[PDB]
Structures are given as C-alpha cells and as structure tokens.
Design a protein around this nucleic acid. Structure first.
Ligand code: ADP
Ligand code: ADP
Ligand code: ADP
Ligand code: BEF
Ligand code: BEF
Ligand code: BEF
Ligand code: MG
Ligand code: MG
Ligand code: MG
Ligand code: ZN
Ligand code: ZN
Ligand code: ZN
Ligand code: ZN
Lengths: 334, 369, 360, 367, 362
DNA sequence: TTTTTTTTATGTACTCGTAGTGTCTGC
DNA sequence: GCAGACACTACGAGTACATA
C-alpha cells in the first residue's frame, strides 16, 4: 500500500462529492490491479468514518484516525478471503450484513469495504444485493473490481460505478523509472503487459516475476526453432501460472501482429525472440496457439482447484501436435 | 510482588465472595477472563470480578495488619476452598513466588495467580441519573416481566428489557413479538425522561443483587453503562442500543369485552388444559359465554381436553385461540386474587391484568383464525 | 437517502410507475374485483421494478379503505409500509435467509393473526436463492395458505425456481423498458428535481441503461457527481466512453481491407485517446448491421448515416453479404469473450485478428 | 359468494370429477371395490396433475361412512371434514416441514393407537422425496408390516430420490401429464361454471401454455381473467402469453423461405408496432420451423390447435428440403445464442434474419 | 373383506418355503444340525430378496421346542408365538428407528438376563447399517465376549457401511438377487395357491420388470390384480408397465438406430407424458452410446451395473458398426450442447433425434 | 516390499458432550 | 432453602451426505 500521484484528482473529486452529502452510498471502483484501488478506498473510508474538521485531509489526532492506523475500528468492515481460501464466502457477507443492522458503536458513520468484488461467489453477491439497494442511513459501501461485467448484473446495477484512468504511458514511464532502475525498453514492456497500470509493472520488478519472465523467454528461444514445445512445462507450472500464460499470450500476439507489420509491439524488450516466432510459425498456427493459450488461461482462473500440471501439460502437447504439418487447426466457436 | 498478609474472617467473606462470583461461570472465552481480583487498600478489601461487560465489587473491612496490594485468583477454586471451613475460622492469604498461600488453622493451600495488571476494567461514564428505590419494589417490578423478554433471537435487541423513566414514575417493558409485558409504578423523585435497554444477563444479575428490605438500592443509569449500589455491593454492566416498539400501540385501546375470574382457578384450569395440548403448538381455543369460559385443547394424537370455568362475563362468543405457555407464565406471575381478561375481536390480541391493580399489564396475540 | 436516486424516487402509486401497462392493468382489475390471489410472482430483469411493484401491491392490499386498486396515499398503515414501520408485512431477502431453518420458522409463524390490516403479506425478495429444502417447505403453504396471508415473490429469473413453485403462483413478467419510456421518466425526474439536463445526454443515458431503469438512475447520479453537478452532453459522453467520431467506420474499413498496420494503429490511437472497448465493438456491430440492411435496400441507409453515406454505400457495394455476416459473427464472439480476457484492449485485438483472417 | 382461487375452489371432490389419469382412477376404484387395500401408495408424476387430490379422494373413499366404497357417496359426515381439511384422522404431513428423523420417530411412536373416528388413520405424506435418509430408514419397517388400521399415502414429484427399499414395499401409481384436449375441456367446464364469457382460441392457447398440468393452467387462466375485464378474450391471452398466435410467425417463415427481404422487414416493423418481445418472435419462428420438420418426417404430426394454419404447413412440407429446414433451424438457433449480445435485440433479430437470407441455399443474396 | 397384502401373508415360515438362495439355506441347515453355530450372523442382500424373512426363520429354528434343528416343527407354542409379533426371547429391534446409543443400551443390557422361554435369547437387529458410532461401540463390546446363551442376527442392505471391526466378528451371508426364472416360478405358485387367474406372458413380464426381488414382484402383482379386475391379463400388465416404464433411453436409442421415426415420436410423447428432465434424459442417452462404443472395443466393458439390460445392450453393440455409433454420439452431443437455447427442451431434443435419424437409413 | 491420497461453496442432518435452567424434593 | 439432583433443553462439534 502506497500513495500514487495520479490518484490525487480522482480522490479530490470523489471526496468533494462525499462531503456535500451527495455521493452515492455504493461505489464500485474499476481500478486495475496494482493501481490506486486500495489506497483510494482506505483514504475515503478514513475520511468518512471519523470527524472531518480539517476538511478533506486526515485528522490524525481524533480517535477515529487512531483506530484506523491501529486497524481495530468496530465500524470499518473489511470483506476479504481468508488465508486458507481464495474466494469470498457467503458466510462472511451474511455475518457482516447482520452486524450492519447494529448501530454504530462510536456514533459516527459506518463503512463496509470488499477487497475485490469479483472474488465474490454468487451467493455472496446475492446476499449483498438487499443491503446495497437499501442500506442503513449511516452506511457506505466500497467495491473493487478489474471488470464490472464479470460481476453479477443485478449487483453491478445497484452500485454506482467509477473509473480510474490509466496514466499516459510517458507519465507512467517517468514515474516508474524514478524508483525502478531497469532499461527503458524493459520498463515499457513491463508497463504494457500490465495494461499501462503502474504498481503492477513495478510489481514485476519488485518481486521475482521478472526473472521468471526472462527464463520463459530463454525457454521459448530454445524451443521454437526446434518445435520441441515441451520442457516449457517447468517454466509454466507455478502459483503464478495465469500471469506467465498471459506473458506467453502477449508474445504470440506480438508475433501475429508483427506478421501484419503493425507499428507498435507489446513485447519490445525482446525483438529477436518475437522475430523468431514470426519466422518459424505460420500465421494460422500462431493464431490457433494464441487462442488455445488464452482459453486454457481462462480455464485455470475460472474453475477452482483444477490441477494445473495436467492442463499446462495437455496444452503443450496440443501445441506440439499443432506444429506438426498436416494437422487441422481448431475454429473459435460460440 | 509484595507479601499480602491479608487476614479475613469467614463470616465477612463468604457472602460477598458468592456475590462477586455470581456473574462469572462456565467455560470462559479466554483464560484470566475467569478470575477475581482482591485488592486491599488502607484496611479495606475489595473483591472484583468481571465478564468484560459486567463487573462486581464487594468491600469489606479489615482490622489485622496487612499491606495495600492487588492480586488475582481463580474464582471457583477460591470460592470452594473458603467454604466448608470451620465456623469463625480466619483465612490468612499471602503472596510468595507468583503463588497464593491460603491458611486456616493447620490447613495450607497453594494457588496459581496472575499479575493484577492482567485484570481488565470496564468503561467510565459520569453524570449518571440517580435512583433510590426499595429492593423488593424493583424485585417485583422486574419479576412481572422477567419471563417476557425473548432469549436468543435476532430481531431488535429482545435479549433484554426496556426501562422508561417519565415524570415521577418508572415503567418496565419486555416482549417477544407475540407476548408483551408492562409494569409501571411511581418512584417518588423528580425524574427526567429516559428509555434504555438492559440486557438479559444484566437482568438476571440485577435479580441476584437484591437482598433484604434494608437500605435502599441506588441505580445509576446512563447510555452505555448501568450501576447498582446495595450497601457495600457495587454492580456495573454494559447496556444495549436500539429501542423496543411502542408498547402504547401494542396495548389494545378498545377493551370492550371484559372478563373477571379467579387467579388460582384459572391458573389450575390452564395447567390442566396444557397437558393434552400440542407439544410444539401449545394452543387452546376459548369459548366465552355469560359467566362461563370454556377451554379446548387438541394434539396430533387427538386426546381432546375440555374444561369449563365460572367467570364474570356478559357478551357474545369470541372463540379466541392462543398459546398456553404464555398465559400460564403470566398467571404464575400475577399471584393476585382476581384476573381481568380483556378481549376486542376474534382476530385482535388479548389483554391480561390484575383486577385490583393497574400497576402491571400484559398482552398476548392470538394463535389461529 | 440524501440525494441517492432510485431510492428516494421509489414509486408510491400505480399511476406513478413507468410502463408495465399489462401488469398494472391485471393487478388493478384483480384488486377492484374479488379476483385476489395468494401467490403473485413478479419476474423480470434487473431494475425493471420487481420490489417496487411488490410494495405497491402490499400498500393497496392493507389500506384502511379496504381492498383498493390505487393505494390511498396519506394514511398510517401505508406510511408505515413506506417507512418500514410495518407489522402486517414481512420483507425477507431470501438471498440472506437461505437456511431452511429460517424458512421453517417463517412457516411456523404463518398461522398467527396480523396485528393490524386484513392480510399478513410475506414479501420474499430474491426468491431463486432459497435452498431447495426451503423451497419444498414453502411449497405446501403456497398451495393452500390460510385466508389471511398472501405471498409475494420477486426474482431476477424464474429458471432457478423449482417448477412446482411456478405452478403455484400467478406469473407477471415485467418487460424491459424501451428507450422512450426511460427517457421520459428520467426527464420527468430531472424536471421535478430542478437539475440542468440536455436532451442528447438524456438519450445517451437511456441508450446505455440497456432497458433497466435503476441503471438509468444510477448513471444519471454518476453524471451528476461528475461534471459540474448537472447533466450535460459533454460530461455524459466523456464518462460513458461513447464514441461520436468516425473511428468506428475507419476501423471497419481497415478491417475489411485487412490493412494490418493501419487497423492496429487505429486501435493504438483509440487506446491513446482511451475509447472504451465494449462501446467500440458495439458500434462496429451497428455499422456492420447497417451494411447488411443496406444490402437489401439503399433506403436502409440509416437516415442519412450522418454525412458519411458514401463510405458505407461504397462498402455496401464492395463486400458480399456472406463476408459481412462472417465479420458480424466474429465481432459478436469477441464481444462475448471480451470480459474473459487479461485486459479489454488485448481482447479487442484478438477479435480483430480473428476477423481479419477471412481473406479480407 | 366471494372470489377464491380456481386452483383451490375446483379441487376434485369425487372420482368422477378427476379428468384424465384413467389408469390410476380405474385401478384405485377397482381395488376399493374388490376390497384389496394395499397399505402404502406412492403417487408420482409431474407437478399439478392431481396426486395430492387423488390421495385425498382415496382418503375419502377409505373413511366414508357407508363403508369401503369406491365412489364416495356424495358428502357424508366423515367426508365433510376431509373437504374442509380439518379431519380428525387424515393426518396431513408436510414432509418438507418434518424432514428431521426426530419427528418421524414421533410419527411412528403413536402409529398403533386406534383411529378416533375413521376406519383408518390415513397418513398423507406430501412430498415424500424430502424426508432425510434417517427418517426414510425409520419408516421402512413400519411400512413393511403396518398395523391393520393405518394406511400410508405418499405423494412426490420424482421417485428416483427415494431409496429403492421404499419403492419396493409400496404400490407405485404414476400420473402422466394431461393432454392438451383434457386441459382445454376442463377449462371450458370451469369457465362455464363461473358465468364468464370466453373465446375458443383463447382457451386453446391456455391449454397449450401449461405443460400438461392443470393447476398451472388454472393459475394462468386466473391471470388472464385479471388481465381482461373478467373475460378470457383472445387479445388478452395473446398479451399475457407473449405468443404470436399462429399467423404472424408463419408469414415470417414463408417470406424468409421466399427470400423476399422487403416483406420480412415490413413484418418486423409491424411486430415492433405490436410491442412484442423479440426473443419471443425468434422462439416462435424456431418452433414453426421444427413443426415443419416434424410434418415432413411424420406425415400426420399436427395437432388440432394448429389446424387454422395446417394447410399452409403442408405447403412448406411439400416445397422445402429437409436439409434446408435443418439449415434454417441451426442458423436461427445460433441467432438465438447471439441475440443477448447484439447491440440491440431488434438489431440482432434483423441481423439473424438477414443471415438466414444471405446463406439461402436456393435464392441467396446477389454479390 | 380383509384381503391381506401379498407382501405379508406369503412370507415364508419354513426353509422349504424360501426360493433360491440355497447357498445360505444349506449352510444354515448344516450349521444348526451340527454343533457349529457362530456367535453373530450378518445377513446381506439387495432390496427385498429374503434377508429379514430368513433371519426370522433362523430365530424360529433356534428356539423350537423340538430343539435346534434345520426344520422348525411349526406346531409348538414357540413356533406359533414367534410366528406372530409377540414373543419374549426373540427381540426384534428396529435399529433404523432406535439408532441412538441411549435406546441401544436399554436393549443390549438385557443380555445379562437369562432367556425366559427358549434356549437362546436371540436379537434380531433389522437395518443394522443405521446405528450411531457410539451404539456400534456398545454392540461391539457386547459381541467381544458374548454370553453362550445369546445369538445375534443382523440384517442390512449395505454391509460396507458397517465398521470393519464389527463385521470381522460376524459370519456374513450374502443373499443373491433372485433370478427371473425363480421369480416366475414363485409367482406362479403364489397365484395358484390363491384365486387369481393369469397368463404366462403376464408373469414373464412381471418377473422381468421385478428387477430380481420378490417384494417388487409381489407389489407389482397386487397392483396388476387391482387394475386387472381380479384377473392378471397380459394387456393389463403391459399397459401398467408402459405407464411405469423408466428405460425410455434404451428403447429410444434402439428405435433411433433402427430409424423408426414413428417409434421415436411415440417414445418422446410417452417421455413427455411423464415428467422427465430432458437434459438428464439426453445426457444418460449419451452415456448409453458411450457404453455401446466401449463394448465395441472389449466385451468386458459392460460391468455388473447394467445386468438388467445386458442382453439388449450386447445385441445393440454387436449388430451396429462402431462408426455409426460415433456419429450418433457426435450429433447427440452437439444437440445437447445447443439444447437449452432451442424453443423448448422437448422441442430441441425432438429435433436432435430427427437430425440423428436423418443419417444412415433414409 | 513401498510410499504413496483429492476441488469447493453451500446447505442439511444426526449424534454425542456439556452448560444453563427449572423444580422438587427430602433435604 | 437449598443445594442438589436430576431433568431437560439448548449448543458445538465431529461427521455424513446432497447439490451444483
Ligand atoms: N417501473 C418503474 N417506475 C419507476 N421507477 C422504477 C421502475 N422500475 C424501477 N424503478 C426504479 O428502480 C428502483 C428499484 O426498483 P425495484 O422495483 O427494486 O426493481 P426490482 O424489480 O429489480 O427489485 C426504484 O427505486 C425506482 O427508482
Ligand atoms: N386430474 C385432475 N383433475 C382435475 N383437476 C386437477 C387434476 N390435477 C390437478 N388438478 C387441479 O389442480 C389443483 C391442485 O392439484 P394437486 O392435486 O394439488 O396437484 P399436485 O399433484 O401437484 O399436488 C386441483 O385443485 C385441481 O383443480
Ligand atoms: N426367499 C423367499 N421366499 C419367499 N418369499 C420371499 C423370499 N424373499 C422375499 N420374499 C417375499 O418378499 C416379502 C418381504 O420379504 P423380506 O424377507 O422382508 O425381504 P428383506 O430381505 O428385504 O427383509 C416376503 O413377504 C415374501 O413375500
Ligand atoms: F433488482 Be431487481 F429485484 F431484479
Ligand atoms: F403437489 Be403439486 F406439485 F402442486
Ligand atoms: F426388508 Be429388505 F431389506 F428390503
Ligand atoms: Mg429486488
Ligand atoms: Mg400436493
Ligand atoms: Mg428387511
Ligand atoms: Zn480523523
Ligand atoms: Zn393507505
Ligand atoms: Zn362420503
Ligand atoms: Zn416348534
């Protein structure tokens, strides 16, 4: 958690709406992961819950700010998946809803914030529906998603939406280079892979993701000219398998797009690699491999508890089958 | 820490120790929570216990040498060891090496202790509204409605009961959504208007507090804390927010149909009728004719039960069907000589009152149409 | 409820609801005559009004005047329903009381006579989330309830409902609201709230609501909170991510000509200007639809198609309808799969690559 | 006097008033006449075809005053309470409300006590497929060798949920869903007895709308009566159902197979003026295509409810190849798949029709 | 008058009145006639095949006044008494009702008392697979050192639900599901011992539809007599079974492979007269085609699950080339994929079957 | 010999251990 | 008067199982 400069306008606007008593109780943030998703929600919640003598800033002396910094306030509910789970169960939602009918202990307003509204199971969202539509007078909600459409349609209606604009790419590169010391092309590539959203591109360098990406690039450089797509299984099977699959998908998209001679490339840090991908693979084969990789990535994320070893191994075996001449490629279908 | 050297007479210890050990009990949520703190300052020993939403303080006087200090002991073990001792025997308690040695005659016992700083305290509130009332007064005030409050329900905060102070009168109400009980009575002091909800556990402890027709109890009411003083006994508890429905609207305003009966006769008739009623739906139906009340009860095994009682009634037949446990409880509580039933309609609720007193009233909703 | 729309603007009389002529007529005729029922089931998509019509029926049933078609208005046993100080009514959000134990508790408290009013009305909202055992528990009571109780059921969809529960209830299907009805209601609200509004921005809001009125109200509130506290065409256009230029048609032409570098530079420039991708795809489908319509008759040039007639005319002359249908199908599949993509931009890229490969 | 729901006012009160289900009625009446009374009956079948009503009628026949009579002799004393539902001995058990075994145990404890008034203490266990497994196992033995003065009537929708060891020791009567003609005739009787005017086409639409049930049909008829001014008229039924009668969609399919786009779009505009759901138009057209396929395969496949257009049906049955029918059906089925994702539902339906037109294998659009 | 149900009045009373299952009757006869009697017999079977009846017969034999014999006399006061419900030494425990250990203790403490009348106090615990874990522990403690005067008789439907330790101390007799011929023979005897006319084809249909259990056969016989006006005719039983048929899958796939359009239409109409989820019907039809294609590869593919429809299935496997089965599976799969979006589920499944029927023949 | 073992979100029962309450008696 | 003695009712947990 850290503050971002580009969050300052949105924050101000939204808080300016809240101070007048006109802001909607149910706010749905569209911020991309790594963007000012949690920082904005925390800032707004801290402003709302405690007193506001200083205006839109933080009055750290008041007991409300003290409880926020201690993280022990009773009227600041957080909906998060537990350590041992991934989705957000309906039991926590039901319990928080029952707790909401209780009047505020401190006599101030109430705030209920969900860490990520996409993680809700259908029952959880349905349970929230009634409280979102008709909440107690002291209550304000805050939702966080990457994709509003992935949410339940009825819940996506009751909650007023709000969008965070990704910063211009030059501004993003300027901000990233300040505290991250990498090459300009590598920095641009990391920014583009994260859909222009900082933090996530910063997260690629801060964590161990970048070394994994480089290992993946080396493995592709070894595999593509030989048609031996196996031995990629080691570079792909991981707790971040969707992210590395997305990296592979970006590489394939870059190859296919450069085949048409497009101006800009998603993967600029490794022009030789994408050039090799263009050389050794037919455009139809590249398109089929890209489609299959994206589909299996969606399979990995959607269904829960699926053994990834089997899925990535099957994907690689099917890719090796595709590279063989005289093989019918699949057709995208409804 | 220091060496206690507290010498306490058993007669001046057993009863206050039982008083302070009342609220605690069962398996606590966490350790230390089940414990009690004894603290001696300038010849006065205070026994304090808590549930972190309740507190008990008992003050006793000491004449023997000592030192000012506070120590914690497990409650049940100390209560059981102090009792059963020979009558008039002094108890000498002394702290060595993080343990408590208790001595009586040639009897020695060692108990594990905790630092006094590990015993939490409750909140503080000032400018509490003060009350001076007789013990048995508030005793029967709550007793008329102690059964009324619903236990373990989500609706409102029915796990408790409402005190309302208006003018010079204190009124107390409880309900469940099907039965409601009110009891209003003039105290004798200039009082403001207040409405508070005391929790069910606090109600039980308040009943446990009352003892003797001696020095009057002193209430200190607030918004989130309640206090009671009975002699050298001090009790504190935490209140409940929210508010009950308007009892005034609950009471029927058209008691057109009247019935006068004997308390004991009606109670015995209802007790007999309840035997053959449905085990879960303990409902009987009532036919009201001139100076006659007939009660009919059924159950899945049939076994129809009928009874007839002489009353003072004039009007038409109503055929009011309602639960038996409720009416049996209220008739148990009345202990009066005569009972007034008040009926409005075959769909309307019914009102139960003392014939010779208006201090307490009750209402019960019907069962089936 | 300070200034939140669609909460302080809940309908309170049958004359105030928007559309729903068939449902309102049926309910009014039932109330006026003796034709009353013990299980009404209002089903329809989001924000068409299920709960509101339910509450209006409840107010009409329990009014002091009696069984009346139009609710009275000023009275105690209607204002209590409006404020939620109700005792003859029972609102249960079934999505929270899914447990069969709570449903059996409800069935246990069905015989008790109401404190006031002639009917104890159980409004079970979000019915389809009840667990199966709870549904079977409600089945018998719905079949033959006591004469003094009536059930009202509202669900986003009846498919999840067990078919027996359907066979127990009177089904009223709230049809989605057309563009004109939504626009009229929003203009009426804004006139009654003295808020500056512009007809074009109102049309964009009505179009983006997708036939659900609560969405229209929420989008109006988003516009009000944005901009300068008033509904204006520029602010609504900016916030909705709508496109009002010929970028869509240029993209269609480039994709038809399969000009890869140009057709990708167009998407890159669109991302630079930040055009929302779902709207861009929707307009692409609209333009292809206008192509197909023109191929039957040039009068199906959409009005005068702004001022770019020639282009689509030219396009309508150069591409066989088979390739147009192929492009439409590919674009629609891409729109379906667009949410299930790492990010919308690259999903639109996938859709464009799929569309370009048909020898365009 | 008063206006109560048809689904509860017109519940059959004798074996004469139960329409259809000839096999179950015949078997029950014959067995009661012969005196052979099994001690466990299980009425299965789809919802609203009379299993609960038949079970209550069987209770009437068993407990009637004059003896074990197949036909309940009108209304006798022991039948009045059955009709009113307050009978001393007919124990209605909402099994879904008593799934716990600690309630079936209480049911079994008092089974031996003699009936208060009736000959048998008929235990009518509604929704027997909802009892918990422990309660099932509990009632196994009491079903195997019950006392001579108790009978069990179990009614459920799907027998497969029940353990097979319970299906073994009870008679299995299966109630088939009623035919369209049965529902239409019963509805004509009901609307005649209510002194309400009605239209034959309206009642045919009511019969078709309900899937072989009756209480569903009665509910939809009551909703129609609400929608009309107390009359069941064809326009009111068309409005409430959302259907296209049998003419407009046939005009659509005839124009579409004729490759005349102009009339197709003209009727699309008219249907928009009719204020009708677009997916309803698509589903009606798909159903018409399927009916064409059915009559092409099976020469005699049209029911009476389509006779008004039957002739035109045969025309398409003699003019269009089966392959073209399959092509149209699959094209419009993908159109249905894609419609919720088109920019506008009207726009999507126009695109689906134009797609069926462009890939017309006989008269495709010129290139 | 009082016509007792055929499921009760025809319960066997001697080992000679028990049909088939000789592998258990002979074993019990040899054990009783000789001295070797185990301390606890556990009877197993499937859905009314003769577990409780054989257990009751064993209890009758153990305590007969003539002595422990394979054939009880049937005349002494004990035989008459156990014949009816009332008897002291034989304790019939509905274990499925008294599952709690609290009720089990009140009856397992009686072992310490002497038998009142007979040699052995016999505990017939029916539906033993239902006891609670603690009750199972109590019964195991009893069985560990059982008194010489007590014999335990346990009857159940699913032996594997029992904990392994209790099963290790019981001699388990598994009762075979009755064959069609034995069913038909016993049904003919039952009908002829009473006044019910019949036709042999009707009894053959009853036996085949009884799924190898005498209770099912007798229940169906009573239903047929009721609907048959006191005579079991072939047409009556056939029509009743048609009202009761559930295997629409195999018949419908037979018709579809043989390409009888009218038969497919009639079977769809019949499956619509019965409330049937079309998705379930289609998916299990896919399963039947899957099993057929498997049997194409190896005769051992058809396991013991589908023994009731083995012959037909084997025939369908033998007479049809595998390529047609693969094509039928493909078209049925694609039809089920698009099924929910069709006009109606009935409508869509109908046209899916038409699509599958248009190929190969016609 | 040998060690080897898996999706989950949610709901529904059943059965035993143990606390909290009532009452009722010979204390 | 009073524990105390059951006697009973409720609740948690361990476990089984259903559905999707
Ligand atoms: N027909 C309508 N007329 C007026 N307002 C409507 C209508 N339908 C929906 N709304 C608005 O939507 C809000 C929620 O409506 P509601 O009736 O709860 O929809 P639902 O059917 O989905 O429960 C209402 O507060 C009202 O502002
Ligand atoms: N066979 C039938 N004959 C006449 N009416 C029927 C029949 N089946 C259903 N109904 C109508 O449906 C109403 C309820 O039927 P019911 O027997 O409860 O169906 P279920 O089998 O689902 O319980 C009856 O009051 C009756 O009007
Ligand atoms: N071997 C058999 N001989 C004769 N009848 C039998 C036999 N097995 C089952 N039956 C018939 O089935 C009825 C119930 O039999 P039962 O022995 O209770 O089966 P279960 O093994 O399931 O307890 C008996 O009344 C009898 O008619
Ligand atoms: F939001 Be509604 F109840 F579908
Ligand atoms: F009993 Be039925 F399903 F209405
Ligand atoms: F009585 Be058996 F086990 F069906
Ligand atoms: Mg709603
Ligand atoms: Mg029923
Ligand atoms: Mg048995
Ligand atoms: Zn602050
Ligand atoms: Zn009113
Ligand atoms: Zn009669
Ligand atoms: Zn003998």
């Amino acid at each position: 958690m850290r503050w971002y400069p580009w969050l300052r306008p949105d924050f101000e606007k939204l808080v300016a709406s809240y101070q007048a008593g006109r802001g909607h109780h149910a706010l749905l943030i569209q911020a991309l992961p790594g963007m000012g998703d949690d920082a904005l929600i925390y800032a707004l919640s801290r402003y709302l819950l405690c007193q506001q003598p200083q205006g839109h800033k933080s009055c750290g002396h008041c007991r409300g700010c003290q409880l926020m910094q201690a993280g022990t306030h009773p009227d600041y509910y957080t909906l998060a998946p537990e350590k041992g789970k991934n989705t957000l169960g309906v039991d926590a939602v039901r319990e928080v809803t029952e707790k909401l009918n209780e009047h505020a202990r401190l006599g101030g307003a109430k705030v209920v914030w969900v860490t990520d509204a996409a993680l809700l199971t259908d029952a959880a969202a349905n349970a929230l529906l009634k409280t979102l539509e008709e909440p107690p007078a002291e209550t304000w909600f805050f939702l966080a998603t990457r994709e509003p459409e992935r949410l339940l349609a009825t819940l996506r209606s009751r909650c007023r939406l709000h969008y965070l604009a990704p910063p211009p790419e030059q501004y993003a590169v300027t901000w990233l280079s300040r505290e991250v010391t990498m090459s300009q092309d590598a920095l641009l590539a990391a920014l583009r892979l994260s859909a222009g959203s900082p933090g996530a591109a910063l997260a690629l360098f801060q964590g161990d993701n970048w070394q994994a990406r480089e290992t993946l690039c080396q493995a592709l450089a070894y595999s593509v000219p030989s048609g031996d797509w196996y031995s990629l299984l080691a570079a792909l099977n991981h707790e971040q398998a969707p992210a590395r699959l997305h990296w592979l998908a970006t590489l394939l998209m870059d190859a296919l797009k450069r085949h048409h001679g497009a101006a800009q490339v998603t993967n600029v840090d490794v022009p030789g690699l994408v050039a090799e991908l263009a050389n050794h693979l037919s455009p139809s084969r590249l398109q089929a491999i890209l489609g299959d990789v994206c589909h299996i990535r969606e399979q990995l994320m959607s269904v829960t508890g699926i053994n990834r070893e089997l899925l990535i191994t099957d994907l690689l075996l099917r890719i090796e089958h595709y590279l063989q001449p005289g093989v019918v490629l699949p057709v995208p279908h409804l | 820490g220091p060496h206690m050297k507290f010498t306490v007479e058993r007669e001046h210890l057993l009863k206050p120790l039982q008083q302070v050990s009342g609220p605690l009990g069962g398996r606590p949520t966490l350790p230390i929570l089940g414990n009690l703190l004894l603290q001696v300052a300038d010849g006065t020993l205070s026994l304090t216990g808590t549930d972190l939403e309740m507190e008990m303080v008992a003050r006793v006087a000491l004449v023997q040498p000592h030192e000012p200090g506070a120590t914690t002991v497990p409650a049940r073990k100390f209560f059981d060891i102090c009792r059963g001792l020979p009558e008039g025997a002094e108890i000498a308690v002394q702290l060595e090496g993080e343990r408590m040695l208790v001595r009586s005659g040639r009897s020695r016992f060692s108990l594990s202790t905790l630092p006094a700083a590990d015993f939490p305290n409750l909140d503080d509130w000032q400018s509490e509204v003060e009350f001076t009332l007789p013990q048995a007064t508030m005793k029967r005030l709550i007793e008329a409605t102690q059964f009324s409050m619903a236990h373990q329900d989500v609706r409102y905060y029915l796990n408790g009961m409402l005190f309302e102070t208006e003018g010079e009168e204190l009124r107390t109400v409880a309900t469940d959504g099907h039965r409601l009980a009110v009891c209003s009575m003039p105290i004798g002091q200039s009082l403001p208007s207040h409405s508070v909800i005391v929790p069910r556990k606090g109600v039980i402890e308040l009943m446990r507090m009352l003892d003797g027709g001696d020095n009057p109890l002193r209430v200190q009411i607030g918004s989130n804390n309640i206090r009671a003083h009975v002699g050298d006994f001090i009790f504190t508890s935490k209140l409940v927010d929210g508010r009950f429905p308007d009892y005034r609207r609950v009471l029927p305003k058209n008691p057109d149909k009247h019935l006068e009966a004997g308390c004991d006769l009606l109670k015995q008739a209802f007790a007999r009728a309840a035997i053959l009623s449905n085990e879960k739906f303990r409902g009987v139906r009532l036919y009201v004719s001139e100076n006659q009340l007939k009660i009919t009860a059924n159950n899945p095994e049939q076994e129809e039960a009928e009874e007839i009682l002489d009353v003072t009634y004039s009007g038409a037949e109503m055929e009011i069907g309602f639960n038996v446990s409720y009416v049996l409880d209220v008739l148990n509580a009345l202990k009066c000589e005569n009972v007034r039933m008040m009926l409005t309609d075959s769909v309307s609720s019914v009102q139960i009152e003392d014939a010779a007193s208006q201090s307490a009233a009750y209402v019960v909703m019907p069962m089936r149409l | 409820s300070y200034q939140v729309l669609a909460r302080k603007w809940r309908p309170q009389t049958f004359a105030d609801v928007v559309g729903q002529e068939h449902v309102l007529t049926a309910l009014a005729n039932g109330l006026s005559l003796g034709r009353i029922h013990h299980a009404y089931l209002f089903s329809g998509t989001r924000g068409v009004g299920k709960t509101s019509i339910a509450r209006l029926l409840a107010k009409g049933l329990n009014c002091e005047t009696g069984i009346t078609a139009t609710p009275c208005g000023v009275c105690d046993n209607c204002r209590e329903i409006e404020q939620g100080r109700f005792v003859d009514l029972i609102e249960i959000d079934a999505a929270s009381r899914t447990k069969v134990e709570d449903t059996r508790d409800l069935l246990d408290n069905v015989q008790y006579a109401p404190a006031r009013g002639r009917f104890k009305v159980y409004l079970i909202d979000e019915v389809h989330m009840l667990s199966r055992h709870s549904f079977n528990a409600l089945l018998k009571t719905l079949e033959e309830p006591p004469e003094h109780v009536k059930f009202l059921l509202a669900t986003t969809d009846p498919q999840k409902l067990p078919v027996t529960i359907l066979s127990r209830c009177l089904q009223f299907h709230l049809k989605a609201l057309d563009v004109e009805q939504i626009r009229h209601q929003l203009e009426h609200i804004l006139n009654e709230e003295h808020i500056a509004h512009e007809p074009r921005a109102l049309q964009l809001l009505a179009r983006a609501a997708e036939g659900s009125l609560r969405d229209a109200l929420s989008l109006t509130d988003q516009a009000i909170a944005s901009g300068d506290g008033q509904v204006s065409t520029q602010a609504v256009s900016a916030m909705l991510g709508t496109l009002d230029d010929d970028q869509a048609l240029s993209l269609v032409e480039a994709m038809v000509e399969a000009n890869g570098e140009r057709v990708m530079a167009l998407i890159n420039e669109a991302a630079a200007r930040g055009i929302e991708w779902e709207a861009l795809l929707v307009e692409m489908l609209g333009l292809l639809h206008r192509i197909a319509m023109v191929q039957l008759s040039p009068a199906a040039l959409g009005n005068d198609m702004a001022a770019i007639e020639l282009r689509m005319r030219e396009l309508a002359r150069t591409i066989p309808p088979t390739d147009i249908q192929l492009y439409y199908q590919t674009l629609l599949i891409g729109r379906k799969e667009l949410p299930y993509a790492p990010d919308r931009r690259m999903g639109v890229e996938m859709t464009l690559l799929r569309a370009l490969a048909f020898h365009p």
